């Protein structure tokens, strides 16, 4: 299951974004102030791809047919079929450390669905407050609002 993660992380801009992939760190909140979910080539992605059904769900690498691949997203035929799991949004980190999104985890402009890598992809949501949300089939997930 681990091999299904894109590891095309090259920090050519030298921002140090990769360390928060492996360690929670201390989010650097200082410096802080419309695509549909198609298919995503895997060699542009660094780390896990999270789609929200709204419940957080990890998307693994597949080929162009939906067959799981286990090459860490190295071959060009590795993709992320985001349009196969439909409010619906996805997010991930591209190779040079930018947060990519399609439609993300924002149920509202105010609240965002929590998941293990929320603060990596969105470092400016750290001071947000979490609380349980129940809503219908029922989804058990947590949200982060101002």
């Amino acid at each position: 299951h681990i091999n299904r993660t894109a590891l095309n992380c090259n920090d050519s801009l030298q921002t140090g974004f990769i360390t928060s992939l492996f360690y929670a760190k201390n989010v650097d909140s200082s410096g802080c102030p419309p695509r549909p979910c198609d298919v995503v080539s895997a060699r542009t992605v660094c780390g896990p791809v999270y789609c929200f059904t709204p419940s957080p769900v990890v998307v693994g690498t597949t080929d162009k047919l939906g067959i799981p691949t286990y090459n860490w997203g190295e071959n060009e035929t590795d993709v992320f079929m985001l349009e196969s799991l439909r409010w619906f949004g996805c997010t991930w980190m591209n190779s040079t450390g930018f947060t990519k999104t399609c439609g993300g985890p924002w149920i509202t402009p105010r609240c965002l669905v929590d998941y293990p890598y929320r603060l990596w992809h969105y470092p400016c949501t750290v001071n947000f407050t979490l609380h349980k949300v129940r809503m219908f089939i029922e989804h058990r997930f947590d949200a982060a609002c101002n």
Partner: antibody
Amino acid sequence: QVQLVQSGAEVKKPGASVKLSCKASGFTFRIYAISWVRQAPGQGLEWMGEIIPLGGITNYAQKFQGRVTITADTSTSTAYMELSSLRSEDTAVYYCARGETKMITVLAGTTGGGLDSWGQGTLVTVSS
Amino acid sequence: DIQMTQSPSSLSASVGDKVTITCHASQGISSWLAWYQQKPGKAPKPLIYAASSLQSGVPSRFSGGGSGADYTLTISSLQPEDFATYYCQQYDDLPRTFGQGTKVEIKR
């Protein structure tokens, strides 16, 4: 499989430097944190630093931040530990250990946390 | 940093007794706590990770528990191979820090 093999037991003089190597095998080198832990004779374990070979993610204990450098070389999957300005206090058994990262605590589901694999250790004596 | 203190620092027991070692942390470490067993001359052997979860291959007589800033390692009944030194180690924060160790020796 999954083993860390260590060697380079060396006797050095004060002021010199020593370079210790750690050949990893049996797991994906890039993803795990190769950490270094030393044990002075009759003393406890002391964590020195860790490297994550993919991003070259290094972190050191602050006491060693101006003497130790840890390097990856993902080609041969061999973590290195270079300690300079050697002191008599650096006489110790230096261990290589594999530590899990956030990418394994999440989206792995294959158990085994902490430092779950250790090298044999190499003994380094520093004396005049 | 996070200071890890164990209790007791020395303990004398015989074969078949139940042992509990305490490990205290200067902050809460969210059960990110590991236990190792070291015999003199050998590398530490991984024992427990994540406070409660058992490392690969170790017998069921070892177990760990706790939460927040206080954890415990318990051996159901000691066996001759179990006499050694035991270290705890938090991995919630950097630097990783160990406790001073507890030496479990044979009673006679």
